[PDB]
Amino acid sequence: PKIVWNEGKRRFETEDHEAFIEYKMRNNGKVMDLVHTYVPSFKRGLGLASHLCVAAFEHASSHSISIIPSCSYVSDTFLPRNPSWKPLIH
Ligand SMILES: CC(C)(COP(=O)(O)OP(=O)(O)OC[C@H]1O[C@@H](n2cnc3c(N)ncnc32)[C@H](O)[C@@H]1OP(=O)(O)O)[C@@H](O)C(=O)NCCC(=O)NCCS
Protein backbone atom coordinates (compact mmCIF):
# COMPACT_ATOMS: atom_id res chain seq x y z
CA PRO A 1 0.00 0.00 0.00
CA LYS A 2 1.77 3.19 -1.26
CA ILE A 3 0.94 6.07 1.11
CA VAL A 4 2.33 9.52 0.28
CA TRP A 5 2.62 12.82 2.13
CA ASN A 6 0.59 15.56 0.39
CA GLU A 7 1.65 18.73 2.28
CA GLY A 8 -0.54 20.94 0.09
CA LYS A 9 -3.68 19.13 1.17
CA ARG A 10 -2.27 18.44 4.67
CA ARG A 11 -2.83 14.69 4.33
CA PHE A 12 -1.12 11.34 4.14
CA GLU A 13 -2.94 9.51 1.38
CA THR A 14 -3.00 6.59 -1.06
CA GLU A 15 -1.53 7.55 -4.47
CA ASP A 16 -5.02 7.68 -6.08
CA HIS A 17 -5.87 10.32 -3.45
CA GLU A 18 -8.94 8.21 -2.42
CA ALA A 19 -8.06 7.25 1.17
CA PHE A 20 -6.48 9.77 3.55
CA ILE A 21 -5.79 11.10 6.98
CA GLU A 22 -5.91 14.88 7.22
CA TYR A 23 -4.07 16.97 9.85
CA LYS A 24 -3.75 20.59 11.04
CA MET A 25 -0.33 21.72 12.32
CA ARG A 26 -0.32 23.55 15.64
CA ASN A 27 2.11 25.30 17.98
CA ASN A 28 4.42 26.59 15.18
CA GLY A 29 4.76 23.21 13.47
CA LYS A 30 5.39 21.28 16.72
CA VAL A 31 2.12 19.40 16.93
CA MET A 32 0.23 17.47 14.31
CA ASP A 33 -3.52 17.32 14.99
CA LEU A 34 -5.07 14.29 13.18
CA VAL A 35 -8.51 15.56 12.40
CA HIS A 36 -10.23 13.26 9.81
CA THR A 37 -9.62 9.81 8.35
CA TYR A 38 -11.53 8.50 5.32
CA VAL A 39 -11.38 5.17 3.51
CA PRO A 40 -13.87 4.51 0.71
CA SER A 41 -16.44 1.69 1.19
CA PHE A 42 -14.95 -0.92 -1.15
CA LYS A 43 -11.57 -0.80 0.63
CA ARG A 44 -12.81 -0.79 4.29
CA GLY A 45 -12.33 -3.32 7.11
CA LEU A 46 -8.97 -4.28 5.54
CA GLY A 47 -6.54 -2.23 7.71
CA LEU A 48 -6.16 0.75 5.37
CA ALA A 49 -6.96 3.41 8.00
CA SER A 50 -4.45 1.71 10.30
CA HIS A 51 -1.74 2.01 7.60
CA LEU A 52 -2.65 5.71 7.07
CA CYS A 53 -2.23 6.29 10.81
CA VAL A 54 1.12 4.44 10.84
CA ALA A 55 2.33 6.74 7.99
CA ALA A 56 1.35 9.79 9.97
CA PHE A 57 2.88 8.55 13.31
CA GLU A 58 6.15 7.53 11.64
CA HIS A 59 6.32 10.98 10.06
CA ALA A 60 5.61 12.74 13.39
CA SER A 61 8.04 10.47 15.21
CA SER A 62 10.95 10.95 12.71
CA HIS A 63 10.43 14.73 12.72
CA SER A 64 10.17 15.11 16.52
CA ILE A 65 6.52 16.24 16.28
CA SER A 66 3.80 15.18 18.80
CA ILE A 67 0.21 14.12 17.88
CA ILE A 68 -3.29 15.18 18.89
CA PRO A 69 -5.62 12.26 18.06
CA SER A 70 -8.72 14.36 17.43
CA CYS A 71 -10.14 11.99 14.80
CA SER A 72 -12.23 9.21 16.45
CA TYR A 73 -10.54 6.43 14.41
CA VAL A 74 -7.22 7.50 15.91
CA SER A 75 -8.25 7.83 19.59
CA ASP A 76 -10.87 5.09 19.74
CA THR A 77 -9.40 2.36 17.56
CA PHE A 78 -5.85 2.90 16.36
CA LEU A 79 -4.27 3.97 19.70
CA PRO A 80 -5.88 1.30 21.93
CA ARG A 81 -4.85 -1.40 19.37
CA ASN A 82 -1.38 0.14 19.02
CA PRO A 83 -0.42 1.48 22.49
CA SER A 84 3.33 1.61 21.69
CA TRP A 85 2.42 4.85 19.82
CA LYS A 86 0.99 6.54 22.89
CA PRO A 87 4.30 8.26 23.89
CA LEU A 88 3.88 10.30 20.63
CA ILE A 89 0.66 11.80 22.03
CA HIS A 90 0.70 15.44 23.13
C1 LIG B 1 -13.27 4.95 9.94
C2 LIG B 1 -12.57 4.43 8.69
C3 LIG B 1 -11.53 5.43 8.19
C4 LIG B 1 -11.88 3.11 9.03
O5 LIG B 1 -11.30 2.58 7.81
P6 LIG B 1 -10.88 1.12 7.70
O7 LIG B 1 -9.80 1.07 6.62
O8 LIG B 1 -12.10 0.34 7.52
O9 LIG B 1 -10.26 0.89 9.18
P10 LIG B 1 -9.42 -0.42 9.70
O11 LIG B 1 -9.72 -1.53 8.79
O12 LIG B 1 -8.02 0.05 9.96
O13 LIG B 1 -10.10 -0.73 11.10
C14 LIG B 1 -11.49 -1.03 11.19
C15 LIG B 1 -11.94 -0.69 12.59
O16 LIG B 1 -12.40 0.62 12.47
C17 LIG B 1 -13.12 0.87 13.64
N18 LIG B 1 -14.04 1.98 13.30
C19 LIG B 1 -14.97 2.04 12.34
N20 LIG B 1 -15.57 3.25 12.40
C21 LIG B 1 -14.99 3.95 13.39
C22 LIG B 1 -15.18 5.23 13.88
N23 LIG B 1 -16.03 6.06 13.26
N24 LIG B 1 -14.48 5.65 15.05
C25 LIG B 1 -13.53 4.79 15.81
N26 LIG B 1 -13.24 3.57 15.03
C27 LIG B 1 -14.02 3.14 13.96
C28 LIG B 1 -13.88 -0.43 13.97
O29 LIG B 1 -13.63 -0.79 15.36
C30 LIG B 1 -13.22 -1.43 13.02
O31 LIG B 1 -12.84 -2.57 13.78
P32 LIG B 1 -13.33 -4.06 13.45
O33 LIG B 1 -11.99 -4.75 12.77
O34 LIG B 1 -13.73 -4.75 14.71
O35 LIG B 1 -14.53 -3.87 12.33
C36 LIG B 1 -13.61 4.18 7.54
O37 LIG B 1 -14.59 3.21 7.96
C38 LIG B 1 -14.35 5.48 7.15
O39 LIG B 1 -13.88 6.18 6.14
N40 LIG B 1 -15.41 5.85 7.84
C41 LIG B 1 -16.14 7.12 7.54
C42 LIG B 1 -15.37 8.38 8.04
C43 LIG B 1 -15.20 8.43 9.57
O44 LIG B 1 -16.31 8.25 10.35
N45 LIG B 1 -13.98 8.65 10.07
C46 LIG B 1 -13.75 8.68 11.53
C47 LIG B 1 -13.76 10.10 12.09
S48 LIG B 1 -12.48 11.11 11.28
For ligand 1, what atom is nearest to the CA of residue 75?
25
- What separation in Å is there between the alpha carbon of 75 and the centre of ligand 1? 11
CB 74 within 8 A of CB 81: no
The coordinates were experimentally obtained by: X-ray
CA 42 – CA 60 distance, rounded (Å):
29
The data reach a resolution, in angstroms, of: 2.1
Task: To the nearest 10°, report the CA torsion of 86, 4, 47, 43.
Answer: 150
Does residue 60 line the site of ligand 1, with CB under 6 A? no
> In angstroms, rounded to a whole number, what is the distance separating the alpha carbons of residues 63 and 37?
21
Topology given in CATH for the domain delimited by 1-90: Aminopeptidase (3.40.630)
Residue ranges covered by each domain of the chain: 1-90
Half-sphere exposure of 67 (CA within 13 A, CB side): 28
